[PDB]
Design an enzyme around this catalytic site. Sequence first.
Site, PDB file in Angstrom:
ATOM      1  CG  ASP B 284     -31.270 -16.817 -38.286  1.00 14.35           C
ATOM      2  OD1 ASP B 284     -32.192 -16.896 -37.466  1.00 14.35           O
ATOM      3  OD2 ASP B 284     -31.990 -18.320 -39.296  1.00 14.35           O
ATOM      4  CE  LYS B 286     -30.089 -18.591 -34.984  1.00 18.60           C
ATOM      5  NZ  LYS B 286     -31.550 -18.530 -34.141  1.00 18.60           N
ATOM      6  CG  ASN B 289     -27.789 -19.807 -38.236  1.00 18.51           C
ATOM      7  OD1 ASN B 289     -28.025 -21.154 -37.911  1.00 18.51           O
ATOM      8  ND2 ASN B 289     -29.302 -19.260 -38.257  1.00 18.51           N
TER       9      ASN B 289
END
Lengths: 504, 493
Positions: B284, B286, B289
Amino acid sequence: SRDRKYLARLKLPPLSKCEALRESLDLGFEGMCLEQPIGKRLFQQFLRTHEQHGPALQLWKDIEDYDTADDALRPQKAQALRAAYLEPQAQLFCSFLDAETVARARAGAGDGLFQPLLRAVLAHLGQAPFQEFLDSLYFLRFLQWKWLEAQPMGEDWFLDFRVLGRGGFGEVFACQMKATGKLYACKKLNKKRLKKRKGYQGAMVEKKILAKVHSRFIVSLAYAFETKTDLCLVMTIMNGGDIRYHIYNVDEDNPGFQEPRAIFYTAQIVSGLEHLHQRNIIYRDLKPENVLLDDDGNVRISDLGLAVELKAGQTKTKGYAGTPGFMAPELLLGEEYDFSVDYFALGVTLYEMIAARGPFRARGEKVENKELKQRVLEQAVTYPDKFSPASKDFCEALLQKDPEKRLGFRDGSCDGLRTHPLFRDISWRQLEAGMLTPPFVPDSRTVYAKNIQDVGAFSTVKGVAFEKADTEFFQEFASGTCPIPWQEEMIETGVFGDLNVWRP
Amino acid sequence: RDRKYLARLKLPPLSKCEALRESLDLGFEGMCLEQPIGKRLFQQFLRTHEQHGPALQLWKDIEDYDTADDALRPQKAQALRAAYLEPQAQLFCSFLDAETVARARAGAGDGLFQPLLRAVLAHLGQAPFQEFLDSLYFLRFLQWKWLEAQPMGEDWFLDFRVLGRGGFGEVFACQMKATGKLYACKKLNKKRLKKRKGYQGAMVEKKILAKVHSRFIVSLAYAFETKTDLCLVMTIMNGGDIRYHIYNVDEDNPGFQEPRAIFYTAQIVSGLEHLHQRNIIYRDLKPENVLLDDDGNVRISDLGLAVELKAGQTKTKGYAGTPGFMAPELLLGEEYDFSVDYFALGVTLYEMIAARGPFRARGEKVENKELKQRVLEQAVTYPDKFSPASKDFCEALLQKDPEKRLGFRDGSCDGLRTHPLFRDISWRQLEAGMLTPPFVPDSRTVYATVKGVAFEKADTEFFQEFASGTCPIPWQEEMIETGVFGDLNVWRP
Ligand SMILES: Fc1ccc([C@@H]2CCNC[C@H]2COc2ccc3c(c2)OCO3)cc1
Ligand SMILES: Fc1ccc([C@@H]2CCNC[C@H]2COc2ccc3c(c2)OCO3)cc1
Ligand SMILES: [Cl-]
Ligand SMILES: [Cl-]
């Protein structure tokens, strides 16, 4: 000074080495945290690092400070102590104490002030706080120091550098503990000479008694060990000569002491006698030649080779022992006796201090033992002008032939003896805490002993081969290092502080 | 500091530490190097035993060298060499062999004393360590390990500000009452978690954050439960997320100047490396984040889609991630490894420079299948904003075939750190957190119901597993940093 090789042998062990020691150790509060200086120190450090125990610790310290403070500072110290620890709003209020205890310590100005409080502080510290100590790293550090304390420290650890006194059975040397630098005296009793004259019992009795007594008025034993030739007792260094020497040899045209000086010694001797008598030990050898001065001029009794320790249930001993003319009538008549004999010898000692002769003999008179014994039993002592009414009355009270009538130890103390008006200008508190300025301060330039070039030599002891019983006895004698004086040394010389590290 | 909770930080009696001693299974590396309180007590031990002085000081001076500003290094090297290594050096370490010594005396560069430090620590791990275990210092370590395991749940934390809202919960700025240390606390609502079946993701995130210790990943310090929430207390990240900085700070000029993008990329890379070396795929990555702290350094966060590969296993399967960031192998339902994270790094970087994704136009919303079709089949183009190096690097990360994609090889991202994009990054200073970040966030700037749910055994049991309590390294760091350890490590005041 020091020597680094021996210093380097003073190291704290790994913890695993202390396991045996932990199982065999007496865990008594009194014996560990009050009487043993390293125990007390580590216990106090433990209290210092745990906030809840601060009031107790600081009160303890401030009571000891009050106890040993000049009279002028006391009222103010008592006010400050009260305000700091016994006011309910105070930062360091001691809320663990019973309210009754607090209310009593807030009142009065008598000689007993804060003793009950101290007893309550120590009775509290002996419970849960001590239990936390035992479960802390400070207790483990104590074990490390006890381990170190128990390591071999015999003759190689000491450096002699001068003779202080000597008699028939050996010499006393000023010596130095090499690791720490501490000055000690070492009594060296010759083995052969002792075997020949059957002196083993005497050497052993003295060693045992000096090991277990701890008093500022009695010489202390710090170490006991043997060498090829000698049995060695390392003890309090006393540089100032004996009292006999200061009576007769110092200012020869004025033999004997002025009364204030003789009274001071008498008070110090009394305090040492009391210490023994409270522990049920009869000295049996008090005389000027066994009372020794240190550098400051304070005195201690010595030579405990004739002492008797009473067992539980035993109030009296018996037997001919001591020096002609210091022996009490009850002793000479073959009666059983207790501490009374020591006070008779005290009387004779004081007499001689003031008069520069014995009370039963003319100057230089040498008489048959049986003639001397008769005078002690039956002849009334006379007192020359040099005695004041109080000197004389006190001597009379001690030289009383009937032990039941003699002044001495009563109700577990010498407190009754202390009210005698001879001692009317002695502050006992300061006397017992070593605070009073002595009357004569010995000279550091001066040897208070017989000139080494004037000492008669002793013949050699021939054909005293040592059997098993002798060598086994020598090993019993050489029990090694005495805990309390050894801990005092480590602290005094800074070794404790140096090795008691955590976060440099 | 709050006296009330500070008071609960008391060292136990030693007898209370028996069970811990009996079950504790730590070696030299775990105890004296990796755990900040063990390392400190171990160094204290060495400092009081004179024979270990050379080894202790050498160790400290090497670590001092490694974290020194470049200008201080020549002279620190000089002094270290003259003190420990030269023929009649006063603190000569006789336990070293001559080859180790001669080489440490020669040359310059970054790992100048790494071989030396390896040798110093190998020596210290033998007899000096054994001696340490037979000392009071080791017992003190047990006492701190006991304190470390005591209940420190919700009542130990004062909330004072919301830092983010999500789907499952909120992140609060909070303060550990006893030490005063500031943290971020992510609270996941129990009922929402059950109803929307988010247990797996909450548990996975918690386990992973607990077993990772990187300056480029949010650190977990405490995990506990309350009536309504599952809570994770972690590194406070006050400076907003990168999506926010790309799009909302200077609205007329979206995206970062290149050197700023590269800085963040280097930090991100280091975080990824730390996961991939522990066999974890993030899945995850990106901009949303990646969070900034007060100084302007970033860390990756939101490990709820991560997966740890089992020992031996080198690939996994499973559709998860964010459309646009998911790699072709994943989109195609194949087995994949760490390679997916690198594809996402390329997308992230592209977006930092371009202020849009590589696969959609500005403000463009597409069907998932139209986007899948693009990610699988379309080549990415690069506007003029990209230097040749950044384009080349993106191209290498966005290769559709994972075998040709730049990433993780031979246990590291060293091969990738070598790409010319990073020619002006000093890796040493980056890895150590010494580099002055390109953007320093302002404090004054705020860079920013469920019914019918009933719980059972299985739920409260899951909750109890999740509340594992305190993580050792971050707890120990907290105790040192805030002075609590120093205050309770005195022997004679
Ligand atoms: F074996 C013997 C050696 C010397 C004697 C001495 C004979 C004269 N009067 C005192 C006797 C004790 O001598 C000392 C002197 C200083 C001391 C000491 C004892 O203990 C601590 O510091 C007696 C017996
Ligand atoms: F439960 C949730 C709450 C908020 C979000 C945010 C949604 C917007 N983008 C960033 C997400 C992460 O938020 C933060 C903010 C500060 C932090 C933090 C995470 O960890 C340490 O300090 C995600 C999940
Ligand atoms: Cl402790
Ligand atoms: Cl230790």
